[PDB]
RNA sequence: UUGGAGAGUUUGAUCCUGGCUCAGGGUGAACGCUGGCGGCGUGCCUAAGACAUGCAAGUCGUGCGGGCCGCGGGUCCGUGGUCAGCGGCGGACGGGUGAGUAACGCGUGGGUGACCUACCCGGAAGAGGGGGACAACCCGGGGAAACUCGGGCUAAUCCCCCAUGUGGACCCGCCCCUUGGGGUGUGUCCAAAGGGCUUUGCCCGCUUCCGGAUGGGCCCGCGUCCCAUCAGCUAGUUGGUGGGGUAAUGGCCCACCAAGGCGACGACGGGUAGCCGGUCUGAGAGGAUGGCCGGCCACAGGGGCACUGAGACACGGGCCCCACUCCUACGGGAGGCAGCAGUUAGGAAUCUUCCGCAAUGGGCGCAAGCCUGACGGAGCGACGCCGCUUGGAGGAAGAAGCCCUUCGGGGUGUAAACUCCUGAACCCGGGACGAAACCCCCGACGAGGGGACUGACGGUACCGGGGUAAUAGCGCCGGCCAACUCCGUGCCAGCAGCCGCGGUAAUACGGAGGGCGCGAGCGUUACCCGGAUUCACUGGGCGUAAAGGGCGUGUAGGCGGCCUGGGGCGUCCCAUGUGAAAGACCACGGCUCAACCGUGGGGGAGCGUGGGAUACGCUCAGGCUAGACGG
RNA sequence: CCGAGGGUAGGGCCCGUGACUGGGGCGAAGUCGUAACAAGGUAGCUGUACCGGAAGGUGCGGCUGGAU
């Protein structure tokens, strides 16, 4: 819908200011917008009608793999969740590079119970899944810098890709930053969209446990070429032989996703819920009353959050509850660190 | 927050005062001349009566009275004084 | 706007030959010459008896699609002659024939009315000097349709004036080849034209 | 004689009554899907809810005197600005809303011998002497502010007195008329103002008086919605008299006397509602309707009120009260968007805090000019209507793909691809009309020529040149009703306006292929009319379908036999006045067409006045016996 | 003097609402019996009065829209 931008206002410590124009990058108050709420996308009248999605992070933290069983009805699976991709854009569906299989991401057990239920009872889907949801991520500690030489010049059929990148640690939750820092043009202009596809394909699997790597920063800066031999299918594997090895060399260390719970247990069963919440790797944050009753709120890693579904029944005689939402990332102790690698 | 309407209101007050003046003396003299017209006191009631008639037309010159208003007040006064002086005559002096 | 759709389906649905592709119609490559049954999955089926409304319905559209005119303007022209004197089931066809784009088609200036419209709309036709790009224009008797000077040098009006070296016009029309100009004589009679349309049924329908 | 269409459904079937429902056309619309352009329209119907800020009525130095300033010097005058103040004129028009009102409020035709009218217009006359005050100004108290108060000086087109009376007004006569109309005689009373320029001259003013013109007031006959489950209502109430008041009649107001006034022809009471031009439907009759535009009325936050005035009992003037809101320095004080935009709430929904005084019109003025949210344009919204574009031509016995299929074939389909052709948009140049008046010059500031200036829209329309194939969506496809198959479903999911569909071969559900209908729109909901001859005047009925009152008597009320005449009320005819404009009707013309817009023609009804006719109805009189009563 | 309004007192109409209640409508594979349509197995309908779990029965008078 359109709306009338009328007064353009700014606010001062002592008074108000009406101005004539607002430049890009800046912010302010505009009067006249009748039916506009926050988080809304405003463009000019005859301008690209685009959403600024921007407000980022869906973000999937549970990995549930699905198997199309046997066999010819695999193309209905990829077409079933396709009806849910434009209908529910929070979870993802991406195949595993190593091990090779589709993993249906999601937000929670109930999120990935209704997708499993509805498909089995509205779309038939010849399938049956596992499935845990431990969906770990891996990243580095110190900056790395390697090379990926993918050269085969002993015959007369292409293959020459020389790609040198700098993988440096980016804070957790920041994501993936790719920049082109070629001095002059030691690599052709066309083989930049395709070297990135070897950097991101190798990042779909890990060196330690085989799970995707995030929170890094690849800086392509130099690399040689051969005019006739170099192919676009020669620089891609050059950007994968330097990503499977940079992150593998420079101090690769583990991380996991923690969740926040709010338990509404009667006060008579508090100490039972508390003591166990900590033996569930818990860091308490405080308690408050509610239905009288009382609510308790802490930080518990997802891995120790499976039995807790029915455990609140074992304790509270069936009088408690919870909610559980993801929060952030950290570094598991070396007791579980050095033992998860198996 | 301005406008000469207050200027206009200022004048109307001055006219209201000057107008409320003449009408009082009109009544004061018209009523007195009719009293002495019941007395008779014949001459002594025309003397006042003339002064009244003047004030009737002096106001009518401006906005204090319309002409019909003057014509009306002049008609009644001459009438109601006459029938009074019909109790005992003597029309002296001039006036009618 | 206008129809801009496929047009040989029309002659099939009507059961008549509504000459509208122009040159293509006379040749035996015409749809009607080949397929007379109406289009669609059940064209060849032996038709079922139409109701009287179906009869009058299939007449009203037959007239419209001959001239190519929207329902609005079609009805307003209809409702005009009715509000006028005389027989409505006549002057209607007159006001249909008094349209500038229809006059351009009968004066040979075009292969088809579909084509004549564009030529009118593209400013290539001036009437009595005034350049008139209005197809909805209504023409009166006493007028001289012509091609513009800056539009006399075109490799398409030529081949249509050259086709009209041989063919003759109707009674109520004048033409001047080489000099590429026309002349509107008078308003026609129901005998002057003989369109495959029983005009009574068109008035017989709108009364409902 | 320019105008008139019906369908489905009660049964096994028939005929009828009769209800139900649909097709049509309409909107200040809105909601769904879709949505390119131009034009002319139009856009808070809900909360007459409350509102931030801005703007919406002001002008004259050719009415007066001051504060300051520039300008020519002898701080004197002159002068130009400028600021308020005094004094004129306007603010009573112009703009908005639809609250209230069932009423002379409106509409229509009159009546005023019961009345008024500023500026404008015409005729007649006149402008001579005197006297006085309040602001500005200085001085002074108080306040945050709003700002007020006190003392003194002073100008005029401000106020006062005397003179003049062509005239006018009033008392009583007296004359013609007939409601208080027109004269005249005597007594009585009243006019005023000056400024300016070129100067024994004009110009704008001023004064009393008669006339026109325009604008009203007041009053009257007729017309004007639902409820009788509202049947009786009324003390200023109805009438007189006297007076008050008003421009003027009047119970309008007041004292008094009288006992009256209204009601089934609907008083009183209740509900709703602004009324007309018109608008829409309709074969007509009738129904519904009152946005926009023109005319009238009413209100200006809710109320009461007077003042000024030519005119208001005053939207942006004043006084008081009440509800609400806000400012504050808490001592106090301010405000009224149903003006133009705008905010907020409510809601299904209704817009730019734009430009211009260039035109038109209004106010002030000698003029220049100044003011003008009236007005002219611009903006927004497919809200409405109207025009236009998304291309034209060639192009297979018919590509691919999808669908159907007796697997022979059929269908989409000349459609596309494809060849030819044109050129929406965009780009470049030119560039409007609306604008010639006021005014300067001649003449005579007259008449008549001649002269310059000014364009918001807008560098828009439109004209020249170049110039690219350039948006298509929606509803239906059982019968009404136009348009058919396939699959999925299995009295499920769902459709449905009516009858009715779905229980494993669904033309009815959802999808697809196919088809019908409309097109920048299409469908839906809400409401008005139509079909409804189903409130029936046109134009229905009542034995059994809904409907004869249980049956008499009789009030008002409706209706009334035969012959002749008087009147002319109904009725009929003519003539005239009226029926504004706009619209509609017909004709033509202006914007490239149209919509839109202009010029001109043509009427009606109904009412006023005058004339006539006399059958029929009425009425006054006379007469008959066929009705009716009676012996 | 009149006067907006304020207040005291007493009335009339309308709307919303109320424990509880009185019937009425739409439903449907019920419980109950089986009144009307055939003389419906007691001819039916009817105004009334009384009684009865319920439809209904009965008394009086009426109607034929009652059969042989
Ligand atoms: S080509 Fe033939 S069938 Fe097709 S529209 Fe022309 S006349 Fe009709
Ligand atoms: Mg504890
Ligand atoms: Mg004020
Ligand atoms: Mg004030
Ligand atoms: Mg003034
Ligand atoms: Mg006294
Ligand atoms: Mg006498
Ligand atoms: Mg064909
Ligand atoms: Mg006709
Ligand atoms: Mg017709
Ligand atoms: Mg050219
Ligand atoms: Mg050209
Ligand atoms: Mg019709
Ligand atoms: Mg005729
Ligand atoms: Mg029937
Ligand atoms: Mg029946
Ligand atoms: Mg049946
Ligand atoms: Mg039947
Ligand atoms: Mg309809
Ligand atoms: Mg819409
Ligand atoms: Mg859309
Ligand atoms: Mg517009
Ligand atoms: Mg409002
Ligand atoms: Mg205004
Ligand atoms: Mg200086
Ligand atoms: Mg000097
Ligand atoms: Mg000085
Ligand atoms: Mg001044
Ligand atoms: Mg005003
Ligand atoms: Mg007005
Ligand atoms: Mg208006
Ligand atoms: Mg209006
Ligand atoms: Mg209303
Ligand atoms: Mg009433
Ligand atoms: Mg009444
Ligand atoms: Mg009247
Ligand atoms: Mg009346
Ligand atoms: Mg009159
Ligand atoms: Mg009068
Ligand atoms: Mg005039
Ligand atoms: Mg003298
Ligand atoms: Mg003198
Ligand atoms: Mg003097
Ligand atoms: Mg102070
Ligand atoms: Mg002070
Ligand atoms: Mg004051
Ligand atoms: Mg003096
Ligand atoms: Mg007389
Ligand atoms: Mg005198
Ligand atoms: Mg005078
Ligand atoms: Mg004097
Ligand atoms: Mg001189
Ligand atoms: Mg006179
Ligand atoms: Mg009632
Ligand atoms: Mg009383
Ligand atoms: Mg009295
Ligand atoms: Mg009296
Ligand atoms: Mg009264
Ligand atoms: Mg008495
Ligand atoms: Mg009466
Ligand atoms: Mg109302
Ligand atoms: Mg009818
Ligand atoms: Mg009405
Ligand atoms: Mg109106
Ligand atoms: Mg309005
Ligand atoms: Mg108006
Ligand atoms: Mg008023
Ligand atoms: Mg208000
Ligand atoms: Mg008020
Ligand atoms: Mg008021
Ligand atoms: Mg007021
Ligand atoms: Mg206001
Ligand atoms: Mg005012
Ligand atoms: Mg405050
Ligand atoms: Mg303030
Ligand atoms: Mg104080
Ligand atoms: Mg103070
Ligand atoms: Mg006080
Ligand atoms: Mg005060
Ligand atoms: Mg307020
Ligand atoms: Mg506005
Ligand atoms: Mg407004
Ligand atoms: Mg709003
Ligand atoms: Mg709301
Ligand atoms: Mg709403
Ligand atoms: Mg709302
Ligand atoms: Mg608004
Ligand atoms: Mg102007
Ligand atoms: Mg003007
Ligand atoms: Mg305007
Ligand atoms: Mg538009
Ligand atoms: Mg259109
Ligand atoms: Mg074939
Ligand atoms: Mg075969
Ligand atoms: Mg075949
Ligand atoms: Mg083609
Ligand atoms: Mg191809
Ligand atoms: Mg072109
Ligand atoms: Mg001027
Ligand atoms: Mg002038
Ligand atoms: Mg002149
Ligand atoms: Mg311009
Ligand atoms: Mg424009
Ligand atoms: Mg040129
Ligand atoms: Mg070209
Ligand atoms: Mg195209
Ligand atoms: Mg093409
Ligand atoms: Mg194409
Ligand atoms: Mg385009
Ligand atoms: Mg349809
Ligand atoms: Mg059908
Ligand atoms: Mg059919
Ligand atoms: Mg078939
Ligand atoms: Mg299916
Ligand atoms: Mg459907
Ligand atoms: Mg049935
Ligand atoms: Mg089926
Ligand atoms: Mg159907
Ligand atoms: Mg279907
Ligand atoms: Mg209806
Ligand atoms: Mg019909
Ligand atoms: Mg009809
Ligand atoms: Mg009817
Ligand atoms: Mg009927
Ligand atoms: Mg009848
Ligand atoms: Mg009937
Ligand atoms: Mg009956
Ligand atoms: Mg009775
Ligand atoms: Mg009798
Ligand atoms: Mg009688
Ligand atoms: Mg008789
Ligand atoms: Mg009689
Ligand atoms: Mg006679
Ligand atoms: Mg008569
Ligand atoms: Mg007449
Ligand atoms: Mg006449
Ligand atoms: Mg007219
Ligand atoms: Mg006209
Ligand atoms: Mg005519
Ligand atoms: Mg033109
Ligand atoms: Mg006329
Ligand atoms: Mg005529
Ligand atoms: Mg006629
Ligand atoms: Mg006679
Ligand atoms: Mg006679
Ligand atoms: Mg007799
Ligand atoms: Mg007898
Ligand atoms: Mg009172
Ligand atoms: Mg009070
Ligand atoms: Mg009271
Ligand atoms: Mg009380
Ligand atoms: Mg009470
Ligand atoms: Mg209850
Ligand atoms: Mg039941
Ligand atoms: Mg029985
Ligand atoms: Mg039985
Ligand atoms: Mg029995
Ligand atoms: Mg009984
Ligand atoms: Mg018994
Ligand atoms: Mg029988």
UniProtKB/Swiss-Prot annotation, chain A:
Gene Ontology molecular function: any one: translation elongation factor activity
Family statement drawn from the similarity comment of this UniProt entry: Belongs to the TRAFAC class translation factor GTPase superfamily. Classic translation factor GTPase family. EF-G/EF-2 subfamily.
GO biological process assignments: ribosome disassembly
Function text: Catalyzes the GTP-dependent ribosomal translocation step during translation elongation. During this step, the ribosome changes from the pre-translocational (PRE) to the post-translocational (POST) state as the newly formed A-site-bound peptidyl-tRNA and P-site-bound deacylated tRNA move to the P and E sites, respectively. Catalyzes the coordinated movement of the two tRNA molecules, the mRNA and conformational changes in the ribosome.
Species this chain originates from: Thermus thermophilus (strain ATCC 27634 / DSM 579 / HB8)
UniProt gene name: fusA
Protein name: Elongation factor G
GO cellular component: cytoplasm
Top-rank taxon, per record: Bacteria
From Swiss-Prot, chain B:
MF annotations from Gene Ontology: small ribosomal subunit rRNA binding; structural constituent of ribosome
InterPro entries for the chain: Ribosomal_bS20 (IPR002583), Ribosomal_bS20_sf (IPR036510)
Assembly description: Part of the 30S ribosomal subunit.
Entry's Gene Ontology cellular component terms: small ribosomal subunit
Summary of the function given for this chain in its UniProt record: One of the primary rRNA binding proteins, it binds directly to 16S rRNA where it nucleates assembly of the bottom of the body of the 30S subunit, by binding to several RNA helices of the 16S rRNA.
Region (Disordered) location: 1-25
Family: Belongs to the bacterial ribosomal protein bS20 family.
Name listed for the protein in its UniProt record: Small ribosomal subunit protein bS20
PANTHER family, sorted: 30S RIBOSOMAL PROTEIN S20 (PTHR33398), SMALL RIBOSOMAL SUBUNIT PROTEIN BS20C (PTHR33398:SF1)
Entries under SUPFAM superfamilies matching the protein: Ribosomal protein S20 (SSF46992)
Keywords: Ribonucleoprotein, Ribosomal protein, RNA-binding, rRNA-binding
A biological process term (GO) from this entry: translation
Curated annotation (Swiss-Prot), chain C:
Amino acids binding Zn(2+): 8, 11, 25, 30
GO molecular function, one term: structural constituent of ribosome
Pfam families xref list: Ribosomal_S4, S4
Keywords assigned: Metal-binding, Ribonucleoprotein, Ribosomal protein, RNA-binding, rRNA-binding, Zinc
Subunit structure: Part of the 30S ribosomal subunit. Contacts protein S5. The interaction surface between S4 and S5 is involved in control of translational fidelity.
Keyword DNA-binding assigned: no
Cofactor: Zn(2+); [4Fe-4S] cluster
UniProt name for this protein: Small ribosomal subunit protein uS4
UniProt GO BP: ribosomal small subunit biogenesis; translation
Superkingdom in the source lineage: Bacteria
PANTHER family in alphabetical order: 30S 40S RIBOSOMAL PROTEIN, SMALL RIBOSOMAL SUBUNIT PROTEIN US4M
Keyword Metal-binding on entry: yes
NCBIfam families, alphabetized: PRK05327.1 (NF003717), rpsD_bact (TIGR01017)
Cofactor-binding details, from the entry: Binds 1 zinc ion per subunit. In a number of structures (e.g. 4Y4O, 5FDV) a 4Fe-4S cluster is seen in place of the zinc cofactor.
């Amino acid at each position: 819908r359109k709306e009338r931008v009328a007064r353009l206002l700014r606010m001062h410590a002592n008074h108000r200011e009406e101005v004539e124009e607002l430049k890009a990058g800046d912010l302010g108050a505009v009067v006249g917008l009748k039916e506009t709420i926050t988080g809304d996308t405003l463009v000019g009248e005859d301008a690209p009608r685009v959403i600024l999605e921007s407000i980022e992070v869906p973000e999937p933290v549970i990995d549930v793999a699905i198997e199309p069983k046997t066999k010819a009805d695999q193309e209905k699976l990829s077409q079933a969740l396709a009806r849910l991709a434009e209908e529910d854009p929070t979870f993802r569906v991406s195949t595993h590079p190593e091990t090779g299989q589709t993993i249906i991401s999601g937000m929670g057990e109930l999120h990935l119970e209704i997708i499993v239920d509805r498909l089995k009872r509205e779309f038939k889907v010849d399938a049956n899944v596992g499935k845990p949801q431990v969906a770990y991520r891996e990243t580095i500690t110190k900056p790395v810098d390697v090379e990926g030489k993918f050269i085969r010049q002993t015959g007369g059929r292409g293959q020459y890709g020389h790609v040198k990148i700098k993988v440096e640690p980016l804070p957790r939750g920041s994501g993936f930053e790719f920049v082109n820092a070629i001095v002059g043009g030691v690599i052709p202009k066309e083989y930049i969209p395709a070297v990135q596809k070897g950097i991101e394909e190798a990042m779909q699997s890990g060196p330690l446990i085989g799970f995707p790597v995030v929170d890094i920063k690849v800086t392509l800066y130099d690399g040689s070429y051969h005019e006739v031999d170099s192919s676009e299918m020669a620089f891609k594997i050059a950007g994968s032989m330097a990503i499977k090895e940079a992150v593998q060399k420079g101090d690769p260390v583990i991380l996991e996703p923690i969740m926040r719970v709010e338990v509404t247990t009667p006060e008579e069963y508090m100490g039972d819920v508390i003591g166990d919440l900590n033996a569930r790797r818990g860091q308490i944050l405080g308690m408050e009353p509610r239905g009288n009753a009382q609510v308790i709120r802490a930080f518990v890693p997802l891995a120790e959050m499976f039995g807790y579904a029915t455990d609140l029944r074992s304790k509270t005689q069936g009088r408690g509850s919870f909610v559980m939402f993801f929060d952030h990332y950290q570094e598991v102790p070396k007791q579980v660190q050095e033992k998860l690698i198996k | 927050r301005n406008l000469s309407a207050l200027k206009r209101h200022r004048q109307s007050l001055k006219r209201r005062l000057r107008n409320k003046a003449k009408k009082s003396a009109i009544k004061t003299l018209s009523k007195k001349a009719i009293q002495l017209a019941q007395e008779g006191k014949a001459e002594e009631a025309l003397k006042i009566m003339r002064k009244a008639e003047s004030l009737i037309d002096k106001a009518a010159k401006g906005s204090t009275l319309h002409k019909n208003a003057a014509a009306r007040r002049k008609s009644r006064l001459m009438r109601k004084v006459r029938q009074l002086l019909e109790a005992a005559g003597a029309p002296l002096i001039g006036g009618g | 706007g206008r129809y801009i759709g496929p047009v040989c389906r029309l002659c099939r649905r009507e059961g008549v030959k509504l000459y509208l592709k122009g040159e293509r119609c006379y040749s035996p490559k015409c749809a009607m010459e080949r397929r007379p049954y109406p289009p669609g999955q059940h064209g060849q089926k032996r038709a079922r008896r139409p109701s009287d409304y179906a009869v009058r319905l299939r007449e009203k559209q037959k007239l419209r699609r001959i001239y190519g005119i929207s329902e609005r303007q079609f009805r307003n022209l209809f409702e005009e002659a009715s509000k006028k004197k005389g027989v409505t089931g006549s002057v209607f066809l007159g006001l249909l024939e008094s349209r500038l784009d229809n006059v351009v088609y009968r004066l040979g200036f075009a292969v088809s009315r579909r084509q004549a419209r564009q030529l009118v709309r593209h400013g290539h036709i001036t009437v009595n000097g005034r350049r008139v790009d209005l197809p909805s224009y209504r023409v009166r008797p006493g007028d001289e349709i012509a091609v513009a000077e800056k539009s006399r040098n075109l490799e398409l009006i030529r081949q249509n004036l050259e086709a009209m070296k041989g063919r003759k016009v109707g009674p109520w029309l004048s033409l001047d080849v080489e000099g590429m100009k026309g002349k509107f004589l008078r308003l026609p009679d129901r005998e002057d034209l003989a369109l495959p349309v029983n005009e009574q049924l068109v008035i017989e329908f709108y009364s409902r």
